[PDB]
Subunit: 119 residues, 4 copies
């Protein structure tokens, strides 16, 4: 279900494996921002979700440092997987940059990403 390759509305690529233990592991490649190529992600998901039609809660983190570039920032996505004919992961995210203490008020962006397995 969750395991596979997903794309968000920006064209970013989220390759994830959902482990039986509730673990999420994989790579994220952002189409935007101070990022290039793949970054490691790790996360957790509800491996025993409700059976009443509710989505599956999940979250994951990317710290935007790889072998090529370091943005000194990290994003967490929090959301739920909705299965079915048109599988989607609906997320909201927080991106925090490292700042000085005086600039901490503007450290964190918020947004929302929707992932499907298409394009």
């Amino acid at each position: 279900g969750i395991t596979g390759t997903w794309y968000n509305q920006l064209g970013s690529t989220f390759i994830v494996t959902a482990g039986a233990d509730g673990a999420l592991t994989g790579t994220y490649e952002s189409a935007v921002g101070n990022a290039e190529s793949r970054y490691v992600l790790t996360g957790r998901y509800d491996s025993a979700p409700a059976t009443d039609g509710s989505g599956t809660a999940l979250g994951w983190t990317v710290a935007w440092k790889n072998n090529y570039r370091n943005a000194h920032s990290a994003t967490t996505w929090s959301g739920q997987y909705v299965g079915g004919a048109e599988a989607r992961i609906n997320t909201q995210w927080l991106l925090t940059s490292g700042t000085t203490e005086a600039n901490a008020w503007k450290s964190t962006l918020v947004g929302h990403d929707t992932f499907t397995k298409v394009k």
Copy 2:
């Protein structure tokens, strides 16, 4: 400086190891919510932060399922670690519960936690 035990303002306990590769691994024990005992956490941090006084960006996820309870929800914390004698991890968080599609509008809580080395 990140590795060790941290406590937030609500009385929750965050036990974490910061790996050399940027991995965060540990356990979270929540003082509030549909939670009981320890939960696995995983996350990522900037393992090569700026040397200009900026904090160290980081994030982690807890899915609120363990051997004792399943809240069908997951929280991600996004923030930065700030060193010194009064070291802190300042975070904002998103808590998404699994919902049906009709209730997705109320799926996600937002808040902020500050973690310190002493409590």
Copy 3:
């Protein structure tokens, strides 16, 4: 371009008047009677480089018929053109006791359009 009736994807409606001073006034008709006062502000002199027009408004969920002891603010931007939109993120805070304040605020997003 802001003044008029807008519809979200959830069947809510709001009618707003954008005053020359930057004021937003109108009524929000929810879906998830149900009309509530809305007030807000918008940038009355936006950039002319294709940037959106920043704006925000608040609705306190009390009227003559019910009171949910809560308030939503929407923060976003108006984007003009053929498919005009107001893209928003919102925060809904409910009145809680201090012990429950950690769970007082929901966050989401809404997109409003001039059609349907």
Copy 4:
């Protein structure tokens, strides 16, 4: 207890009047960001809050344009007033800047401000 002069943890000044109709009016002066002097605010608050010890929900908006400066941005604060012993307004806020469509993903900052009546 909402009406008065409030200051947040940054030293910003929030001057507000709560109208009997649920209206919030006043001025906001930010200690940080692309802002100078006072800006108009408007908002709403629950004028018949619960009597069980719960706070009073409220929210307000500032568009960061005044006679001196225009940041092409607007902030909304959503929060609750908590009386008793030491009056406080605890908020979370969203600051949206006007952006191109390509830059809309980075349009919105989020944070939290706590206000008390204690001058810096």
